[PDB]
Amino acid sequence: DAFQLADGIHYILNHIGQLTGIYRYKYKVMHQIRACKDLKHIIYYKFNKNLGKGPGCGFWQPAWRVWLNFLRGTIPLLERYIGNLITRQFEGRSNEIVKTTTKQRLD
Amino acid sequence: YTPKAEMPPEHLRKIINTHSDMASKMYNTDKKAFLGALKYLPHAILKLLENMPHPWEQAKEVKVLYHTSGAITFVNETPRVIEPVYTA
Amino acid sequence: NEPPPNICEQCLGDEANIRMTKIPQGSECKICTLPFTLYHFKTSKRSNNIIKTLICVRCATQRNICQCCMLDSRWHIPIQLRDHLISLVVMTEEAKNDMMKRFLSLKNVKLGGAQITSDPSEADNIVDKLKNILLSFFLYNSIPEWKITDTVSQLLSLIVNHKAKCGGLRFQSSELGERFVSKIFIIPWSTAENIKLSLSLNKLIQLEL
Amino acid sequence: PRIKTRRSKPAPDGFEKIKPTLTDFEIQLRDAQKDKSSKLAAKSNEQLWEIMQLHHQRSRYIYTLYYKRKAISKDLYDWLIKEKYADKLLIAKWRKTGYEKLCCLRCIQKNETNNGSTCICRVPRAQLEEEARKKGTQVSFHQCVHCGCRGCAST
RNA sequence: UAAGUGAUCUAGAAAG
RNA sequence: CAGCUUUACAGAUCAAUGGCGGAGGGAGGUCAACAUCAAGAACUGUGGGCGCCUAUAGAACUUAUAACGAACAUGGUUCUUGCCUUUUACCAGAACCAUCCGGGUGUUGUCUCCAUAGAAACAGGUAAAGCUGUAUUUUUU
Ligand SMILES: [Mg+2]
Numbered sequence A: 001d002a003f004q005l006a007d008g009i010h011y012i013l014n015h016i017g018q019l020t021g022i023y024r025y026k027y028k029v030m031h032q033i034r035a036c037k038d039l040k041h042i043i044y045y046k047f048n049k050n051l052g053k054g055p056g057c058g059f060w061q062p063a064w065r066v067w068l069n070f071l072r073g074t075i076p077l078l079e080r081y082i083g084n085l086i087t088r089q090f091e092g093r094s095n096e097i098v099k100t101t102t103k104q105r106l107d
Numbered sequence B: 001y002t003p004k005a006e007m008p009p010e011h012l013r014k015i016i017n018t019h020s021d022m023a024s025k026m027y028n029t030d031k032k033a034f035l036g037a038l039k040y041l042p043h044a045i046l047k048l049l050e051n052m053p054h055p056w057e058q059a060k061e062v063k064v065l066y067h068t069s070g071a072i073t074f075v076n077e078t079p080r081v082i083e084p085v086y087t088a
Numbered sequence C: 001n002e003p004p005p006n007i008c009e010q011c012l013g014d015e016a017n018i019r020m021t022k023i024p025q026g027s028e029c030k031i032c033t034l035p036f037t038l039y040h041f042k043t044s045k046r047s048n049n050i051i052k053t054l055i056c057v058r059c060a061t062q063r064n065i066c067q068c069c070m071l072d073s074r075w076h077i078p079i080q081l082r083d084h085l086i087s088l089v090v091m092t093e094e095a096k097n098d099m100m101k102r103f104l105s106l107k108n109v110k111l112g113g114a115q116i117t118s119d120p121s122e123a124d125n126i127v128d129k130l131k132n133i134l135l136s137f138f139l140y141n142s143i144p145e146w147k148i149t150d151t152v153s154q155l156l157s158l159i160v161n162h163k164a165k166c167g168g169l170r171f172q173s174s175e176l177g178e179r180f181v182s183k184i185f186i187i188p189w190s191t192a193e194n195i196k197l198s199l200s201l202n203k204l205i206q207l208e209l
Numbered sequence D: 001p002r003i004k005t006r007r008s009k010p011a012p013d014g015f016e017k018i019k020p021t022l023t024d025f026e027i028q029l030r031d032a033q034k035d036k037s038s039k040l041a042a043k044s045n046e047q048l049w050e051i052m053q054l055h056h057q058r059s060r061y062i063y064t065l066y067y068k069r070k071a072i073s074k075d076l077y078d079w080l081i082k083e084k085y086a087d088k089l090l091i092a093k094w095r096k097t098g099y100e101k102l103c104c105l106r107c108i109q110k111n112e113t114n115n116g117s118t119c120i121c122r123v124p125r126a127q128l129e130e131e132a133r134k135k136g137t138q139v140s141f142h143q144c145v146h147c148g149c150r151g152c153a154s155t
Numbered sequence E: 001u002a003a004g005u006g007a008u009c010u011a012g013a014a015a016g
Numbered sequence F: 001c002a003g004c005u006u007u008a009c010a011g012a013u014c015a016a017u018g019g020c021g022g023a024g025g026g027a028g029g030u031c032a033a034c035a036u037c038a039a040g041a042a043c044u045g046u047g048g049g050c051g052c053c054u055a056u057a058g059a060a061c062u063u064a065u066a067a068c069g070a071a072c073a074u075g076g077u078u079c080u081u082g083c084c085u086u087u088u089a090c091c092a093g094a095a096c097c098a099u100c101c102g103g104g105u106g107u108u109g110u111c112u113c114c115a116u117a118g119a120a121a122c123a124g125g126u127a128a129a130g131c132u133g134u135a136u137u138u139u140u141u
């Protein structure tokens, strides 16, 4: 149903965290996840005032917005990262220079 | 200069379908293109997500750019609204 | 910074305007396998198939050759042949190795002969020197079959072994053969003694292996 | 066409008459939109070309009925335009001079092309042929790589 | 004659 | 119901002077290219007076619980923290910095959809729109 679809979307956006590992690989998505959770808490309490506890709360908007904004940051990072990887695959580095500012190797 | 040709969606669909079972020396370059496209796949994702049809909408038509190789497809339009109306 | 493309007159075309695109580090040169700018031109607008440059400018300079034709810049002869001529009046040894070829390319010595071709002085002198220097039926009794075939045609499947020297021509028509006989190197049907002996020897040779 | 979602009213008056003509087109499109395992670049291109032609044809039919024949209401035409059926830009181009026989819009995007010019299809057969004659060679090009358009020109 | 209102960190994946 | 200024009007002599004049589009595209948008509350020229005063002027946009966003991401660098004990990946604050998702404004250029006139005022009318008016001591009885 349309309502069901909406609810599903909402679930996805809140549950990104559980639904699929992004956080594993980049653990600042954790902030985003937290924000989403907070929104859910707020939104659900607003939405289920006189109405009781259960699934079927739509109103995915703020969560969606949050995810969009998160994606903004990634765009850049991914373009450096993924792009770099593809470059490597086509043309794979010549003479890298290690860096002694590392704790290891300094001494 | 002169704007982009509004292509038919049919063409796009056909292109997409062709690059499913892609394993000939034909489209060697298309594979390369696809590989390259990872660069912009997150951008594409962001776009598509942004255009998500809202629950007051059965199905949104949306502007689309796509590499003629079939490697990547960006939803092009950026969805703006009359704020109060949107809120309502 | 980049040097210019060295494309010959016959290479490039017969027209007073050609448009080409440069593709910086387009392909690796065939000699050196080292990135370089591809120029590729279409000769006449509509005449099919492009003419991409196959070698790096440096390599061309070294060999003194068209970047498309792979022929001498001056005389338009294959590198071997041009070099061979010079030798006759020393040739280049392109080192066919992954690493070494690149090194060779980067060297700037004009490999071998190229110098002579480049200079009006030297090329001309060489030319002068060269000038001076210059100034059914079996078949029996080396030359190629494409010549034999031509000869046959003129006279009007054609098997010929060379170790044997025994050419069994089979026109498969009584008309062609009877025309062939009248219109006319021993040629029977399906110093003569010496010839016979030689033939026999050849046959023996063929048959021992 | 797009999918109906109660956005625009089902159709104006004379759609029932033309619908069966432009519903043949849909079938053709469907046949086109799929894995024809072309196994070959030229062959692959051909299907795309065919698709393009089909797209053009429907628009032409619509255009023809609305402008040249003038047998369809303005409102209906507008509705069609709004829907994905016709191509609006293409129609506009057709309406303009020198672009009446026009394979597709991207054959006259001068920006696109490597050499700053239009597609060859736009050259009238006459001129190319003449050039060929002058040269020595026969007729040089058959169809462009954007869309199959043997002699697109208005002549 | 007057107690007892509210402040609530976190949060996993790889390689080693 | 008077007066003057403008349109809509004949037929003028058409000087006189004005004003509309090298008199020729409009509406728009999830269309471009360029310029420019954090600075002494901050703008740009113009001459003149001689890098600064004095007149001219112009001025679109963004700003006072300070900003192009009633919107909010991510990087990089140091410093300090926290989980920790290897790093990435992280905690959270700071300072510089960048990237990004966007935004205007102006000028062109295009794309689309609708359209087509090269001359009218004066003497004053006809009709309609803008404003003013309603003799006995200081204005004109
Ligand atoms: Mg170790």
Ligand SMILES: [Zn+2]
Pocket: C007, C008, C009, C010, C011, C012, C066, C067, C068, C069, C070, C071
């Ligand atoms: Zn040449």
Ligand SMILES: [Zn+2]
Pocket: D102, D103, D104, D107, D119, D121, D122, D144, D147, D149, D152, D153
């Ligand atoms: Zn065409």
Ligand SMILES: [Zn+2]
Pocket: D102, D103, D104, D105, D106, D107, D119, D121, D146, D147, D149
């Ligand atoms: Zn075309």
Ligand SMILES: [Zn+2]
Pocket: D103, D107, D119, D120, D121, D122, D144, D145, D146, D147, D149, D152
């Ligand atoms: Zn064409």
